[PDB]
Amino acid sequence: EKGASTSLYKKAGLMDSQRSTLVHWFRKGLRLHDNPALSHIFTAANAAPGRYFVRPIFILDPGILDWMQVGANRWRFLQQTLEDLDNQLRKLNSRLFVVRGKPAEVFPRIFKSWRVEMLTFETDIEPYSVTRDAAVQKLAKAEGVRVETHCSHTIYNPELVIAKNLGKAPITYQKFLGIVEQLKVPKVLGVPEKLKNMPTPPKDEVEQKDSAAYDCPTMKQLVKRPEELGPNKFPGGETEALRRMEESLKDEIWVARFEKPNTAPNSLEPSTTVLSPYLKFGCLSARLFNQKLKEIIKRQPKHSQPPVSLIGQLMWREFYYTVAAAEPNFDRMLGNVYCMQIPWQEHPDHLEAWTHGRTGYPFIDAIMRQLRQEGWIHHLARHAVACFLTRGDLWISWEEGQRVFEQLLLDQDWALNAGNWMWLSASAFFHQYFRVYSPVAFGKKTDPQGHYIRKYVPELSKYPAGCIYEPWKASLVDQRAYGCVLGTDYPHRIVKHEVVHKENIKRMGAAYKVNREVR
DNA sequence: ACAGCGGTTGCAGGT
DNA sequence: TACCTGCAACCGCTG
Numbered sequence: 260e261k262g263a264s265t266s267l268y269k270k271a272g273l274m275d276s277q278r279s280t281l282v283h284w285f286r287k288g289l290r291l292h293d294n295p296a297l298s299h300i301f302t303a304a305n306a307a308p309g310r311y312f313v314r315p316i317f318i319l320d321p322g323i324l325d326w327m328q329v330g331a332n333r334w335r336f337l338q339q340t341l342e343d344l345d346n347q348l349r350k351l352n353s354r355l356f357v358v359r360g361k362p363a364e365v366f367p368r369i370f371k372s373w374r375v376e377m378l379t380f381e382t383d384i385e386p387y388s389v390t391r392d393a394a395v396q397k398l399a400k401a402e403g404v405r406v407e408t409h410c411s412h413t414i415y416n417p418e419l420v421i422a423k424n425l426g427k428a429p430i431t432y433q434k435f436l437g438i439v440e441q442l443k444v445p446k447v448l449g450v451p452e453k454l455k456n457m458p459t460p461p462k463d464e465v466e467q468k469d470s471a472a473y474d475c476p477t478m479k480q481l482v483k484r485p486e487e488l489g490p491n492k493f494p495g496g497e498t499e500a501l502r503r504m505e506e507s508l509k510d511e512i513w514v515a516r517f518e519k520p521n522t523a524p525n526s527l528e529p530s531t532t533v534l535s536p537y538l539k540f541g542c543l544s545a546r547l548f549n550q551k552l553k554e555i556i557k558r559q560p561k562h563s564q565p566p567v568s569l570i571g572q573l574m575w576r577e578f579y580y581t582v583a584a585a586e587p588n589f590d591r592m593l594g595n596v597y598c599m600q601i602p603w604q605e606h607p608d609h610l611e612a613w614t615h616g617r618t619g620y621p622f623i624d625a626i627m628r629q630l631r632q633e634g635w636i637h638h639l640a641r642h643a644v645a646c647f648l649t650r651g652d653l654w655i656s657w658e659e660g661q662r663v664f665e666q667l668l669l670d671q672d673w674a675l676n677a678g679n680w681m682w683l684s685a686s687a688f689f690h691q692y693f694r695v696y697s698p699v700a701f702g703k704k705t706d707p708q709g710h711y712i713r714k715y716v717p718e719l720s721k722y723p724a725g726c727i728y729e730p731w732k733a734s735l736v737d738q739r740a741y742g743c744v745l746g747t748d749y750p751h752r753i754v755k756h757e758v759v760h761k762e763n764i765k766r767m768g769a770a771y772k773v774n775r776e777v778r
Numbered sequence: 779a780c781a782g783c784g785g786t787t788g789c790a791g792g793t
Numbered sequence: 794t795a796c797c798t799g800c801a802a803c804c805g806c807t808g
């Protein structure tokens with residue numbers, strides 16, 4: 260009987276050559292938890308153990324760099340995320356395969372060599388993803404590969420929101436809420452089960468030439484300019500995502516009473532959750548986070564509501580996802596159905612100054628430096644610098660600010676970055692352009708001593724709180740006494756806010772009329 | 779039809 | 794304190 264059982268597994272070792280492959284394709288959805296596309300594959304494999312190999316893949320795609328600027332800090336985040344993801348898949352008797360190449364070229368090969376029966380992935384609405392996925396579905400159809408996609412990057416499916424709103428994406432938040440209240444949310448899933456009867460798949464032609472061909476990229480492979488790395492304040496991956504979420508949810512009174520407008524842009528520690536990079540890469544399920552918040556809200560029936568509550572912030576994400584789904588030119592002014600056409604000026608020197616936090620406005624400069632160094636800044640810090648760049652002071656296109664954020668943010672999100680840049684430039688969604696953030700006054704409310712400025716603009720760290728926000732008010736002798744002379748150790752302010760913002764408000768009114776008269 | 783309402787997160791000067 | 798008004802007056806939705 261022991262002899263018999265031995266004969267059985269020896270024979271099955273030949274049978275293994277006859278297996279087809281089930282592929283889950285990670286792009287976002289970079290997590291095991293609440294991942295229906297992944298769970299699909301793992302359930303299919305375990306429902307028929309012996310029949311399939313499982314290949315969880317991430318395609319490290321050179322085409323991304325034709326579309327997106329990616330700074331060193333975000334490359335490091337991705338490196339860490341893929342490593343965490345392989346660690347978690349290992350626990351399930353699997354692993355991550357990181358296939359280098361463009362999807363259009365990779366998929367023809369692997370469909371054939373792995374004998375792929377089914378491919379799953381989490382859907383996405385970005386133009387890159389739309390064109391990519393269309394090409395892959397086309398190829399899978401031709402090649403007879405079953406493709407099942409799942410919508411789980413968002414709580415609501417943009418397509419279904421647009422359908423329920425009679426074919427149009429809602430363009431106001433309250434209307435969006437009224438629509439999504441009528442939609443059901445799928446069940447939030449746990450991590451998939453361990454794979455049964457899953458020997459490692461046989462090496463393909465690539466693996467045969469280099470056994471490490473699909474192994475997780477190193478820092479050296481992914482970060483080509485490590486001199487641009489800052490402190491690793493927000494480590495990548497689902498494990499860190501979940502730890503951070505549980506920590507952020509620990510104070511249920513803080514959660515229950517959360518109002519975004521009352522959180523500081525310049526607290527030295529984040530005043531909000533900093534779950535955004537995790538949500539952006541899919542290291543954290545938005546649907547799980549929402550579920551967790553809802554549990555807390557049950558226990559704390561006295562709680563804040565949208566727009567300002569924590570659930571409210573998730574809904575903003577959903578909101579911008581839906582409007583972005585409907586408009587591939589979401590990230591440009593021209594041809595963007597939502598966007599006010601505003602004659603922004605080009606000014607290379609001012610853009611450079613803003614980009615590198617050398618505007619001569621300490622608050623603005625502090626924020627831009629934190630962003631560059633750390634890759635996260637608070638929402639209202641983003642407001643301050645985005646308003647400054649666009650309608651507030653420099654009159655430079657929101658698209659140029661978008662580009663800088665796109666490089667520097669760990670949470671860089673096509674829809675969210677574009678949506679909020681339009682908001683802040685009063686190009687779309689927000690239209691009360693008479694409200695202009697003051698680069699001098701805005702930060703004072705939450706940091707009267709200027710601690711944040713003293714940290715990120717250390718050259719000004721000896722200035723009295725009375726002029727650290729407005730160092731040009733200090734005489735030359737006082738500047739010398741504070742160890743920082745304007746024009747020498749810190750730049751002269753590149754524009755005068757008190758003049759230019761009034762001029763820009765007039766320009767905004769004139770642009771608005773032109774746009775009105777087109778309709 | 780177009781007035782009235784509400785709109786995540788303005789500032790300054792004031793109660 | 795947490796809130797108010799004046800400042801000029803925008804948008805989309807609603808009826």
Ligand SMILES: Cc1cc2nc3c(=O)[nH]c(=O)nc-3n(C[C@H](O)[C@H](O)[C@H](O)COP(=O)(O)OP(=O)(O)OC[C@H]3O[C@@H](n4cnc5c(N)ncnc54)[C@H](O)[C@@H]3O)c2cc1C
Nearest residue numbers: 531532533534535572573575576638641670671672676679
């Ligand atoms: C000009 C500008 C550019 C921005 N670019 C991005 C970006 O590329 N990627 C990005 O994730 N956020 C972006 N934001 C939105 C917002 O600032 C960040 O989501 C937020 O600061 C992240 O911090 P948090 O996770 O601690 O937010 P929390 O306040 O803790 O909110 C929780 C989650 O809700 C979502 N959320 C919060 N605020 C917004 C918002 N305003 N719009 C949409 N979703 C929101 C995020 O996923 C966030 O993680 C931008 C904002 C501005 C003003």
Ligand SMILES: O=c1nc2n(C[C@H](O)[C@H](O)[C@H](O)CO)c3cc(O)ccc3cc-2c(=O)[nH]1
Nearest residue numbers: 286287318319320323329383385387388671
């Ligand atoms: O499929 C990929 N997605 C990558 N993405 C994820 C990307 O957001 C999704 O592929 C989107 O679906 C593209 O529209 C990255 C995102 C970043 O912010 C930075 C780098 C990458 C790199 C890749 C990549 O190599 N392959």
